[PDB]
Structure formats: structure tokens, C-alpha cells
Amino acid sequence: MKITVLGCGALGQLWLTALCKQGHEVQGWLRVPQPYCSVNLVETDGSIFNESLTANDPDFLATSDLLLVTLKAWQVSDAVKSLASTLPVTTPILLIHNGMGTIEELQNIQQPLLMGTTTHAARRDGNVIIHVANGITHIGPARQQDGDYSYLADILQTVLPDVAWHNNIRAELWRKLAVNCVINPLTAIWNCPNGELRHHPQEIMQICEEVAAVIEREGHHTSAEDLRDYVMQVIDATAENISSMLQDIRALRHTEIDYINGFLLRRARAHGIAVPENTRLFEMVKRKESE
Secondary structure, X not given: OXXXXXXXXXXXXXXXXXXXXXXXXXEEEOOOXXXXXXXXXXXXXXXXXXXXXXXXXXXXHHOOOEEEEOOOHHHHHHHHHHHHOOOOOOOOEEEEOOOOOHHHHOOOOOOOEEEEEEOOEEEEEOOEEEEEEOOOEEEEEOOHHHOOOOHHHHHHHHHOOOEEEOOOHHHHHHHHHHHHHHHHHHHHHHOOOHHHHHHOHHHHHHHHHHHHHHHHHOOOOOXXXXXXXXXXXXXXXXXXXXXXXXXXXXXXXXXXXXXXXXHHHHHHHHHOOOOHHHHHHHHHHHHHHHO
């Protein structure tokens, strides 16, 4: 098939490479138009893959069979709306990113919309992309009207193992966003490795109690304590790492906070749930971004 990949960064080059090695017709799409996307990715065994692909061709977009989006969350909805009048109104759009809240920004999209997240790990070092680890990409329908597109998880399985379809993909999205609402902003505000958080159990519970209150009202079964125990287990296992949010902070790149604790605040707001710790952290990180 013909696929346009939106974003030629780490995750976008990992998909372009995999689609490209299965023989699919592919193009990338850049925010700053260029006729080609130069892919240079290192495979998990250290092998290189390096090709020059077509980019930003409107005719190739108008005949594409899948729009695969791999931008950061705060970029997604504007970039998708820009291309949706050109992509066929029958062609499915798959969003892969961390965080939640892009579907609410895309509710009038006519095309089939699918939402997803991955545990594959891909790092960008300058113009080099490193496929750090293999993993699973979970996808599913964004709205009630997108439920008949489970065939994409079978095609994608053949391209970048493993892929799983979930009829209620929001359950898996919240599991990851719950943990990120604790780890990302705390590390960001205390500019510490994940392991520091181990020294702050009482406070982590308070955030988890707020997170747990919003999720329960959203229709999912979780407990504040269960959530707390899991976060601490993640913190122990990733003790020396620098989070994705702290990484953004240290490089002064915009953060995905509007789609992590910002989404919890928005949903908390819609259900009327008290979230003072999450609001403080959200506002703090926003002040750091501005400087």
C-alpha cells in the first residue's frame, strides 16, 4: 500500500524504515517542506539502514491508503487538519504518541481515526536515529465510528512487530498516562533522575489519589494504592534514567505536559474532581517552559 508518514523524526524514521523494508510505497511529510526525508537508522543489532525517501508530495498524499502520524502530541491536531482536505476522505489516519487529548481536537475529522501508543524506543542523535529497543504498538478506534479498522493491526504486524488491536484502547492509554503524570513533572521540577522520586512516597500517593479519582470516573478499574505501587516499581527499575519530560526541559524543547497532566486537569474539570497537586505541577512546568 501507499503510506504517508507525518513527521521524519525518530519514531517516524523507524516506521518509514520498516514500511520501506516490506516494499510499501512510502513518503514522509515535514513541517518545513523539503522534497526528501533522509533516513539513517541504526537497527537493534547495530546494522545500518540509509535511504532517501520522497517527502511532501501532495499528489502522493492524495492517493495514500494510510496517514501514519508520529509527531509529538502538541503538534498533532493542527498538522492532521492541514492535510485532511487533501488525503482521501476514505483513508484511515493513525495517531501514535504519548499522552491524551488529540482526539478531542480532531472530532470533526471525516476520515477513520485510530489512536495508538508504542513501547518501541527510538532515539535521535543529530541526524542519526537509533532503534534502541523493540516493543509493542497498541492501536484502536478513536470514536465509535472507527471500530471497523482492525485490519490495519494485521498489516502493521507484518511491518514492525508486534502490533495489537484493542476495542477500548483508552484503557491502555490511561495506564501509561497515569504513571507519566507522576514521573514526568516531578523529575522536571526537581531536575533529578527517576530514582530521586523513591525518596518522596507520601507526595507520590497524593498525586496517585488524584489520578485514580479521574480514571475511575472515566470508566476504568484502578486503585490509588495499586497505581502507587506500580509507579514505585517503575522508578526502581529506571532509577538512573532521565525522563522524557526532563529531557525536554534540559534541552528547552516544548514539553508534552498539555497532553499528560494537562489532559488529566481537563478531564478532572469535566467530571468535577479536585486536582490541586496536579494543577500545581502543571502550572510549575508551564512557567519553566516560558522560562
